[PDB]
Amino acid sequence: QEQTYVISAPKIFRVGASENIVIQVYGYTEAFDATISIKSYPDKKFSYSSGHVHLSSENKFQNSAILTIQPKQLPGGQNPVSYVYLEVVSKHFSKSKRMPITYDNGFLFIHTDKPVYTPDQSVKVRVYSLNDDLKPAKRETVLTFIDPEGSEVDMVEEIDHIGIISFPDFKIPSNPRYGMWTIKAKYKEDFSTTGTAYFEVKEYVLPHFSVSIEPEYNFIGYKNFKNFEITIKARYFYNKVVTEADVYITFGIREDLKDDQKEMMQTAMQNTMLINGIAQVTFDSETAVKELSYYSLEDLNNKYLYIAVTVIESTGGFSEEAEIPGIKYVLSPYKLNLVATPLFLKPGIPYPIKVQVKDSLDQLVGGVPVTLNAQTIDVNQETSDLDPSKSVTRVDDGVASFVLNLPSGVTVLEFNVKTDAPDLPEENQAREGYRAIAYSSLSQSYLYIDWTDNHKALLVGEHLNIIVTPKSPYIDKITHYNYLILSKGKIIHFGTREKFSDASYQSINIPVTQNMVPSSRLLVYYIVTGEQTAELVSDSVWLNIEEKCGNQLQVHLSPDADAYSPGQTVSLNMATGMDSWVALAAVDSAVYGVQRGAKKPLERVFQFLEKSDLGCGAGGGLNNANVFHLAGLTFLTNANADDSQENDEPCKEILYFPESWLWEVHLVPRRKQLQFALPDSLTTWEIQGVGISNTGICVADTVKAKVFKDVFLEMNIPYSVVRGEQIQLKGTVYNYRTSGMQFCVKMSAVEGICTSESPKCVRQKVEGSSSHLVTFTVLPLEIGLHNINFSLETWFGKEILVKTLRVVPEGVKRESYSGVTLDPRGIYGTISRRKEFPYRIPLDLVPKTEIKRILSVKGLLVGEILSAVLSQEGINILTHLPKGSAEAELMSVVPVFYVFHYLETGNHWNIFHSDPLIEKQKLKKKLKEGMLSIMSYRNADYSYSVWKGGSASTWLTAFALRVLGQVNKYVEQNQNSICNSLLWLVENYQLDNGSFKENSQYQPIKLQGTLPVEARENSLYLTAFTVIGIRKAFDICPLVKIDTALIKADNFLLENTLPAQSTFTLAISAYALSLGDKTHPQFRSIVSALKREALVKGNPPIYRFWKDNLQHKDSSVPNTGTARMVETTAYALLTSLNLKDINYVNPVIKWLSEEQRYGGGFYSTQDTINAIEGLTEYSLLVKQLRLSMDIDVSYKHKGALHNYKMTDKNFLGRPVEVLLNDDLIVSTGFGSGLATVHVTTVVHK
Amino acid sequence: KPFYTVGEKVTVSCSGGMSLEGPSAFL
Amino acid sequence: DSGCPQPVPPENGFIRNEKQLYLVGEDVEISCLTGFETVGYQYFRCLPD
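Above: the input entities. Below: the structure tokens describing the complete assembly.
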């Protein structure tokens, strides 16, 4: 087995990805060619891609093909391709393996211009759109917006041309549900690639200064339950301290991190003082607990503290607050885990171990002593204990590190690591146990690497050097090892590393090119032929690479300043190693200050890009196959190994005053200069930008531009003021001068506010470096948006401070709901394609609180469609068994009418093209001849007998009436003859209790008929059967006495079905009742009984059917019992179809489609007819629910408002504000399917 | 210009005294 | 998945479209029995809890 190959490939193919497949062969000397091909699965017919590769000593018999799966070449449709054949073909070998494929190709980074938005805002939003290759994807993208209730609100589409998809601004609806909204992004047609972002909608006003609350520990232990100590600091959004603030502390019990509201204490509620930006506080938790808790001891509290702080600037008007719920009281507060450790051993090589200590609510503790105890085995299970070892954790990294000089012959190690903090006993000093295992070569053939796991990221463009040491009984054979460098899903470098005459091998001396960032994985492998049997030997290591951009893009203000003045014109420079696009945006730091723990949207970009990597762990493996699988590869080889041993386990180890502006995109032709004016606001603006090119993304460093002023006035205006009340609004002048000066304030306002202060002042002086309270008891008269201004005049200065006050009405913002289902076909009953909604006015409307009206619309989708259809045997079902005696003619033509009806689904006449068409004119002929035949079976009195002189039968009359209901589209029977038939039936055989007892024929017919009941309530069958036929004829002979006979028959059949007669009678009765009052309470009870009697397969039912009468006996051929089964199931089907219960029907259709009990029923005309009727009805129902509904909505006297093209592809248009005070009329074109339309009204009462 | 590159800003304005809706640039 | 289980209809109400489970943001329509008329807003909407 000297001649051997390895083909190595990603564990999973990404659709549309360019995948690099590498091949090595051994024991060959004649140069030869191979082809590596990606082929359809299982049939291998279509070839997606193919690569010819040539192998020779000129290539050291190594090569690669670049192969790709362009997404349109897949068949697509509802069933996407799960699997594809990878193939290799040569003169010497042919093999193929079933690769999995994935449609997850690339990255959709949603960036919203803020994380928080008020109502009455539009979001700016854009999406960065990148391939798996990290190039700008240039693909159509779609956004979907979900409210905090999980209700879809809007969808919008845009076409990428750049990698930067600047979607239209989303106007927040006129009445949003407050809370966490979500944006999802998808490539429209052909990828999963689902991006996500979150944003919060709330009534808020920007904080005027940050409060930062800084406990010394996220946990309280024995050392700090006696006394816990905490720092608080406060700083403006210009980076200067709060000079003085009054502080009120609050403490409380807590029992959950997630969601509890346990009681606050009423002790240590310390009113205290913050100076020079800082307050220092201490809580004696022991005494507070013992005083006011029911707890008295820490051992009762593996639980949490709540802490909150509020503060008010001691010489001003602004106030702020925050909290830190969840400081963990815990007896064992630490936890431990590995980081970057393999758990695989190279013997004799110093084996490194690293551990991270973490907390509950984990941070890097960094300060813990830890110690290690270990036991080993080398050979024949000689259990050998190691000497213990000790490290501190690193204070910054958290890492405690160890290295074990294990025996040169060690086979396994298992060990414990425990916290050695002398203050914690081992019941408290957190501890863990772990096992590592050797590579388990059969050939004792190994390939170790001289890698210490250098903790420090490799810098881009350095040469990595790794010496590599195969060790083997057969090293003389091992001419070269082969190496692969993989990044993310993809092999990016491959090569060969020759043995020197030193009996050692060329190291991997390679540049870490930019494509390797942030992480790459090195796998080295060889095949050694052994004595006769080949073995693939491999090892791999994760290589951490410096995070660096390919563009090296940099951005800076060219007129650099520590702080700029408001409105200052500035110049900005963008410089790059190559021509690039760049997006820019600016956002105020108070915005992020709004939300505790807010995230910068371009955070984690590299760690998110790393989620693309298919591997897990830091390297190594229990085996060659395990090494490749953990490396994220798979391989085809004859060298006695296969990756089918392993599976994709969930491996998860650890390794003007705007809010926003400058929201733009620009080209930078290697360099660009911009000139622009700053806003009038005072803050740190954070200016952030993202470079994009065919070289990929870069995120630039955030330029924090300060805008500042030494003397100014500010006002703590709340988000809205309730109309008609007066409130003392508070604020303060600030002096950051060395000296005090006199100031004066002369507030002015639009007449929408008139207030008794009537803003010659006190002309107070602020002290130097101090603030002075300013207050106004403004009393708003008029609702809405009103300009208020705080003009100020002062010694050596003036200031202007325009504002818009929002005034909101008194009372309660109550909401009310109304809506309907649009049903332009009457699937549920009354055709309902118009509705009207007057502008109704509540009797408790407050006189000025004009009612807000909002519209919403939903499409209702078909769901699962099960393509149950006839075989080509429809030819036979038409050409049916020879016409003749026993009314073989009747039994032949009776299916013809129903096959006709079935094809009058239309599809099957529109398309038979898999097979030669049924000739439509042949069908029409056959139908006509059928009508001619069926006339021959009418009795003179319009009863029916199969024999011309035979006994008249109500049974056959009802059958005829059913048939004659169908035919009328081509051949109506004269209504008089139908009326005569019905009249004769009802007038002779209506009865006082039960009905339609068969008149004069006790002799059954087998293939035309079906099993009667036992005499007990056998009338149920007759009543049901006759009812069915009558209802199918009733639309062509309405007669009030017949209606009365229906009502009677239904009453009797119901009253006789209440005792749950044997299930066939129940099923046929339920089918009869589904023709009647579909909402009759007892009908619905009988349906519930039918549903309880169903049989199913699978917990979610895949198949559903009914058995009775020991039909669980075997039947390999159709028979009376299989007939009973097929008919009773077809009746349950038709019942549920009349309830339109598609979701319940589906597993019935599937079970029918199987034809289990093969051949069907007894091949009666009954079972076959009723089955094909049910299948026809289903086929109809699917097209009925198919959504196409062009809604139009207009006011009554005022004009049209809006139109919705509600369609399967666009099933949900945005909600619309119903602005105008007129009656609203909504309607639709006839179209198809179902919708629901709502209007809701908000009124302040 | 006969065409406007994406993200570059045009300017459109009518003569004095006319009233005009919509933005001064379209993208 | 904590999708809402099927609600019990009100007295003299019934569900037009029964299912084992309803999606979050799915709505269900009640309707009245043959002898009864709806008063009030006939939809229930499945919340995340």
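Note for the figure: Chain B touches chain A through four residues (CB under 8 Å).
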